[PDB]
Amino acid sequence: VSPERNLVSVPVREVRLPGADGDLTAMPGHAPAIVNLRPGLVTVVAGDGSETEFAVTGGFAEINNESVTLLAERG
Amino acid sequence: XXXXXXXXXXXXXXXXXXXXXXXXXXXXXXXXXXXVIELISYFVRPVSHSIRLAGNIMAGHAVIKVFAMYGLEVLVCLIQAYVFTILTCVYLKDALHP
Amino acid sequence: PAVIEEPDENAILNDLLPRSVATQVFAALLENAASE
Amino acid sequence: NLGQLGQYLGAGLACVGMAGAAMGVGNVAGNYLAGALRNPSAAASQTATLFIGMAFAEALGIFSFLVALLLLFA
Amino acid sequence: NLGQLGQYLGAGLACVGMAGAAMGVGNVAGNYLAGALRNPSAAASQTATLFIGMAFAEALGIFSFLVALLLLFA
Amino acid sequence: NLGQLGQYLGAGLACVGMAGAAMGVGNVAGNYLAGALRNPSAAASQTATLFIGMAFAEALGIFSFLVALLLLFA
Amino acid sequence: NLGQLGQYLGAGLACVGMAGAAMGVGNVAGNYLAGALRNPSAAASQTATLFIGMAFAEALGIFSFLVALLLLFA
Amino acid sequence: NLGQLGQYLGAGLACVGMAGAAMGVGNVAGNYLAGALRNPSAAASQTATLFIGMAFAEALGIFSFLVALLLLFA
Amino acid sequence: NLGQLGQYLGAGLACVGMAGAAMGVGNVAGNYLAGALRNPSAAASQTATLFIGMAFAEALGIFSFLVALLLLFA
Amino acid sequence: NLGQLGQYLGAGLACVGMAGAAMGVGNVAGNYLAGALRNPSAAASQTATLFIGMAFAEALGIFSFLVALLLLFA
Amino acid sequence: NLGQLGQYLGAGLACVGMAGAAMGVGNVAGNYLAGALRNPSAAASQTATLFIGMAFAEALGIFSFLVALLLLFA
Amino acid sequence: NLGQLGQYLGAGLACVGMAGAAMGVGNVAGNYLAGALRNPSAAASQTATLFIGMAFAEALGIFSFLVALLLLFA
Amino acid sequence: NLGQLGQYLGAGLACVGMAGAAMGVGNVAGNYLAGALRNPSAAASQTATLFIGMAFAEALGIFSFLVALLLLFA
Amino acid sequence: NLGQLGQYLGAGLACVGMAGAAMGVGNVAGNYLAGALRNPSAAASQTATLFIGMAFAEALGIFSFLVALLLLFA
Amino acid sequence: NLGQLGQYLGAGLACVGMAGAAMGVGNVAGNYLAGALRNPSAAASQTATLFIGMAFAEALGIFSFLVALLLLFA
């Protein structure tokens, strides 16, 4: 989600996002975590393996039991 | 306060000069600075600076024997003079109050 | 300053606080426009 | 001969003692560098503390040199 | 001769003891530098604590020097 | 002569023991400095704890000095 | 003479043992200081734990002193 | 005489063994202090674990004391 | 006499071996305390693992005691 | 007599070797505890890995025991 | 007699060498456990790497055993 | 007899040298495991680097084996 | 005979020196692996630096081998 | 014969000294790799500093080689 | 002959002392590299501090060389 709307709202196998300290690959069941990310590409492995890449201006990544939620900035 | 600065400017002038060490002179500055922690430490602090000044003659003389440097020696002379002034703060402040 | 709900902790709090203030203002704007 | 063997090995043991001194001083030095990164504005405090902190780290190394010189030259 | 071998090796062992002292003091010193970075405003507290903390780290090094001097000069 | 060799080397070993003491005390000291940075307001608690904590770190160093003095002077 | 050489070197080895004790106790002490920073409000718990934790860290140092005193005075 | 030299040096080596024990126990102790900071509410669990964890860290130190006492008094 | 010198010094070396054991076990113990802080709810898993993990850390210390007892009493 | 002195000191050196083993195993153990905190849900994987990882850490300790027993009983 | 003293002490020194091996392998093992926590999904990669990494850590321990066996049985 | 005592003790000292090698290699290995966790996608780079990095860590261990074999078999 | 005892023990001491080399090189290697994780894109810089950095870590190990070979073969 | 035993063992002790050098240099090297990750853009500064920093870490290793060569060839 | 054995072993012990120096200096060096990453803009301060800090780390290594040269050439 961004300030304006829901950017992703569906099942995914994993996400790859560049954190403030380093790269983060979040799989199902990852332990609860909060990290700011750097501007750059976010890799989303949707549903049945279909990959999609999107350039983000940065934001905050929140991980819990099942769902991972990227709170993306517009700049 | 002001007399301590005159004492510090005197000891720093001796330390900044140095040239050919000042081993015997450091023991006198310790007694002047004093006037377990009181007895033993007061002599050790001053003697360490003159031990550093004695190391300059050790580095210069022994290195000459190898053949037949100064930047680290010169800058360390300034560093040793600062600790003597800083030592006066330890004695004056703890004794002044409370 | 902000008021409580009643890789580091301090580093992420350094960016979220200015970014939270930002969103409150934006929330107030949208509310204020629909009230208008 | 025999007595000098004691003295000579004492000088070596004294030199071994310096392995620690250089380590401890190194610790002190490294904090300074890291601090400059965070607060170049506080170089005033850093520089002052450099002298004081460095002096302490040195002194025990100097005292060991004196002991080594005693063992070597009576 | 023989007895002096004991004394001489004792001086070396004493010098070896100082390897630790310089390390411990170094630890203390490094915290000061790191603290200046975070709070230049608390230099008042830092400076006061410098003396106290540094003194403690020194003392045991001085006591070892005395022991070394005893072994060396009876 | 021979017996004194035992005593003298014992004094050196005792001085070696102090290498640890200075290290441990140093650890304690460094935490104080770091704590001042975070909470200068809690200097009251810090100062009180300085005495208590420092005393403990010292004591075993003092006991070693006594042992060294015994080995040296009977 | 010979027997006393054994005893004397045993006292030194005992003093060497204390290098560890001071280190371990130091560890314990440092956690207290760090904890005060985070929770000055929990000083009640911290102070209580100081005694208990510190006592444990001390005891083995005391037992070593007894052993050193045995080696020194029969 | 000769045999007692073996015994005496064994007591010293046993005292040296305690340098580790105090270190390990110290580790355990320090975690407790850090944990209090984060969760004063979980002091119930912390206190219970203090006993259990501390006991384990102690035991091997006690066994070493027994061995030292054997070497010293047959 | 001579043979017993070998045995006695072996007991000391065995006691020195325990310096490590106490350290390793300490490591294990400290993780437990830190884990309680994060997840008091998972004390079930923590307690179960305490036994298993602690047992492993102990065993090699026990085997060393047996060896020490062999060296001491044939 | 003389030969047995070699054997006996070898047993001690073997016991000294175990100081490392307990340390290494301890490392392994501590990671398990930390992992439980983060992912209690992955205890299945953790438990399986406990056996495998622990076995490896043990083996070299066992081989040292065999060597100690050889030195002790031919 | 004399020659066997050399051989026997060599076996002990070889056993001492294993103190390191167990430590290094332990390091490797602990990373695996920590990695499982972060990425249970990457257990495929972790398991494969376990074998490879563990093998390397083992090999030098095995070579030391061979050397110990040579010293012991010619 | 006498000469072989030199050779035999040299083999032991060589085995002691391997305590370090296993430690260093272990360091290298552990970084690989941690890296897999963060970037399973970069296993290509990791695997390539595994060979190169591991080879370097091994080589000096091999050279020590050669030296041990020289001391043992002329 | 006697002279060769000096030479042989020198080879062992040289092998002991390599315990450090493998450790230092290991440090260097591990940073590379960690760096790949953060910036796979900077593998160009990493690979170039691998050679340079690794070479330096190796050289002193090679010089020690030469010294060992001198002691062994005159 | 006898004198050469002194010289030969001195060469070994010199080789042992290099265990530290490789460690220290390794430290320096590893920081470079980590720095590249964070700031590939600052490779200009990094490369320049590589030379300077590396040179310092090397020099004392070279001086030890000279000393080893003196002990070996008068 | 005998006396020279003392001198020669003293040179080796002096070379062993340098193992520490290289370590301490390495510490200092590594902080510089890390600092460049964070603040390339503060290279002015970093470069100035490089000289000062590096000089201190060197000096005690030089003093040890002098002592080694004394032991070697009277």
CSV table of N, CA and C in Angstrom, one decimal, chain J residues 3 6-7 10 13-14 16-17 20-21 24-25 27-28 31-32 35 38-39 42 45 53 57 60 64 67, chain K residues 1 5 8-9 11-13 15-16 18-23 25-27 29-31 33-34 36-37 40:
chain,number,residue,atom,x,y,z
J,3,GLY,N,59.0,-43.5,32.5
J,3,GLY,CA,58.1,-43.7,31.4
J,3,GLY,C,56.7,-43.3,31.7
J,6,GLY,N,55.8,-39.6,31.3
J,6,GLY,CA,55.4,-39.3,30.0
J,6,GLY,C,53.9,-39.5,29.7
J,7,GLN,N,53.5,-40.8,30.1
J,7,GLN,CA,52.1,-41.2,29.9
J,7,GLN,C,51.1,-40.3,30.7
J,10,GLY,N,50.8,-36.9,29.3
J,10,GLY,CA,50.0,-37.0,28.1
J,10,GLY,C,48.5,-37.0,28.4
J,13,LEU,N,47.5,-33.4,29.1
J,13,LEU,CA,47.4,-32.7,27.8
J,13,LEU,C,46.1,-33.0,27.1
J,14,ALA,N,45.7,-34.3,27.1
J,14,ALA,CA,44.5,-34.7,26.5
J,14,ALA,C,43.3,-34.1,27.2
J,16,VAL,N,43.3,-31.2,28.7
J,16,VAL,CA,43.4,-29.8,28.2
J,16,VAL,C,42.7,-29.6,26.8
J,17,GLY,N,42.9,-30.6,25.9
J,17,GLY,CA,42.2,-30.6,24.6
J,17,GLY,C,40.7,-30.5,24.7
J,20,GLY,N,38.6,-27.0,24.4
J,20,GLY,CA,38.1,-26.5,23.2
J,20,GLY,C,36.7,-27.1,22.8
J,21,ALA,N,36.6,-28.4,22.9
J,21,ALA,CA,35.4,-29.1,22.5
J,21,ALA,C,34.1,-28.6,23.1
J,24,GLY,N,33.2,-25.2,21.5
J,24,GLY,CA,32.6,-25.4,20.1
J,24,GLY,C,31.2,-25.8,20.1
J,25,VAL,N,31.0,-26.9,20.9
J,25,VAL,CA,29.6,-27.4,21.1
J,25,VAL,C,28.6,-26.4,21.7
J,27,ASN,N,28.8,-23.2,21.3
J,27,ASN,CA,28.5,-22.3,20.2
J,27,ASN,C,27.2,-22.8,19.5
J,28,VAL,N,27.3,-24.1,19.1
J,28,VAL,CA,26.2,-24.7,18.4
J,28,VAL,C,24.9,-24.7,19.1
J,31,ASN,N,23.0,-21.1,19.4
J,31,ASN,CA,22.3,-20.8,18.2
J,31,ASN,C,20.9,-21.4,18.2
J,32,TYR,N,20.7,-22.6,18.6
J,32,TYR,CA,19.4,-23.3,18.8
J,32,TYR,C,18.5,-22.5,19.6
J,35,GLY,N,17.4,-19.3,17.9
J,35,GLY,CA,16.4,-19.6,16.8
J,35,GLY,C,15.0,-19.9,17.3
J,38,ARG,N,13.0,-16.7,17.6
J,38,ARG,CA,12.5,-16.1,16.4
J,38,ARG,C,11.4,-16.9,15.7
J,39,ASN,N,11.6,-18.2,15.7
J,39,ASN,CA,10.7,-19.1,15.0
J,39,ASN,C,10.4,-20.4,15.8
J,42,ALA,N,9.3,-23.3,13.6
J,42,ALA,CA,10.3,-24.1,12.9
J,42,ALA,C,11.1,-25.0,13.9
J,45,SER,N,12.4,-28.3,12.3
J,45,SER,CA,13.7,-28.2,11.6
J,45,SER,C,14.8,-28.1,12.6
J,53,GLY,N,23.9,-31.6,14.1
J,53,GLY,CA,24.9,-30.6,14.5
J,53,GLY,C,25.6,-31.0,15.8
J,57,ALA,N,29.8,-32.0,16.7
J,57,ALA,CA,30.5,-31.3,17.8
J,57,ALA,C,31.0,-32.2,18.8
J,60,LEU,N,34.8,-35.5,18.0
J,60,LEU,CA,36.2,-35.2,18.2
J,60,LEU,C,36.6,-35.2,19.7
J,64,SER,N,39.3,-37.9,21.4
J,64,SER,CA,40.3,-37.5,22.4
J,64,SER,C,40.2,-38.3,23.7
J,67,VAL,N,42.1,-41.5,23.0
J,67,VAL,CA,43.5,-41.3,23.0
J,67,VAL,C,44.0,-41.1,24.5
K,1,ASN,N,61.2,-47.0,27.1
K,1,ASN,CA,61.7,-45.9,28.0
K,1,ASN,C,61.8,-44.5,27.3
K,5,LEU,N,58.8,-41.8,25.5
K,5,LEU,CA,58.4,-40.5,26.1
K,5,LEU,C,58.2,-39.4,25.1
K,8,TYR,N,54.8,-40.5,23.3
K,8,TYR,CA,53.7,-40.3,24.1
K,8,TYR,C,53.3,-38.9,24.2
K,9,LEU,N,54.3,-38.0,24.4
K,9,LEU,CA,54.0,-36.6,24.5
K,9,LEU,C,53.5,-36.0,23.2
K,11,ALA,N,51.5,-37.7,21.1
K,11,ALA,CA,50.1,-38.0,21.1
K,11,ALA,C,49.3,-37.0,21.8
K,12,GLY,N,49.8,-36.6,23.0
K,12,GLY,CA,49.1,-35.5,23.8
K,12,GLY,C,49.0,-34.2,23.0
K,13,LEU,N,50.1,-33.8,22.5
K,13,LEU,CA,50.1,-32.6,21.6
K,13,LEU,C,49.2,-32.6,20.5
K,15,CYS,N,46.3,-34.5,20.5
K,15,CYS,CA,45.0,-34.3,21.1
K,15,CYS,C,44.7,-32.8,21.4
K,16,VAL,N,45.7,-32.1,21.8
K,16,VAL,CA,45.6,-30.6,22.0
K,16,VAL,C,45.2,-29.9,20.7
K,18,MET,N,43.2,-30.9,18.5
K,18,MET,CA,41.8,-31.1,18.2
K,18,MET,C,40.9,-30.0,18.9
K,19,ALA,N,41.4,-29.4,19.9
K,19,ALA,CA,40.7,-28.3,20.6
K,19,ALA,C,40.3,-27.2,19.6
K,20,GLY,N,41.1,-26.9,18.6
K,20,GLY,CA,40.8,-25.9,17.6
K,20,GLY,C,39.7,-26.4,16.6
K,21,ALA,N,39.9,-27.7,16.2
K,21,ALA,CA,39.0,-28.3,15.2
K,21,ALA,C,37.5,-28.2,15.5
K,22,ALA,N,37.3,-28.7,16.8
K,22,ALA,CA,35.9,-28.7,17.3
K,22,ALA,C,35.4,-27.2,17.4
K,23,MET,N,36.2,-26.3,17.7
K,23,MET,CA,35.8,-24.8,17.7
K,23,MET,C,35.4,-24.3,16.3
K,25,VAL,N,34.5,-26.0,13.5
K,25,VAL,CA,33.3,-26.8,13.1
K,25,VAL,C,32.1,-26.2,13.7
K,26,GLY,N,32.2,-25.9,15.0
K,26,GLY,CA,31.2,-25.3,15.8
K,26,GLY,C,30.7,-24.0,15.2
K,27,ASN,N,31.6,-23.2,14.8
K,27,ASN,CA,31.3,-21.9,14.1
K,27,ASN,C,30.4,-22.2,12.9
K,29,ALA,N,28.5,-24.8,12.2
K,29,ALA,CA,27.3,-25.4,12.6
K,29,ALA,C,26.2,-24.3,13.0
K,30,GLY,N,26.7,-23.4,13.8
K,30,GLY,CA,25.9,-22.3,14.4
K,30,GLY,C,25.3,-21.4,13.4
K,31,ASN,N,26.0,-21.1,12.3
K,31,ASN,CA,25.4,-20.3,11.2
K,31,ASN,C,24.2,-21.0,10.6
K,33,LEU,N,22.0,-23.0,12.0
K,33,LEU,CA,20.9,-22.8,12.9
K,33,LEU,C,20.3,-21.4,12.8
K,34,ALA,N,21.1,-20.4,12.8
K,34,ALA,CA,20.7,-19.0,12.7
K,34,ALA,C,19.9,-18.8,11.3
K,36,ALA,N,18.3,-21.1,9.4
K,36,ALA,CA,17.0,-21.7,9.5
K,36,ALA,C,15.9,-20.8,10.0
K,37,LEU,N,16.2,-20.1,11.1
K,37,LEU,CA,15.3,-19.1,11.7
K,37,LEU,C,14.8,-18.0,10.6
K,40,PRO,N,13.4,-20.6,6.7
K,40,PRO,CA,13.0,-22.0,6.7
K,40,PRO,C,12.8,-22.5,5.2
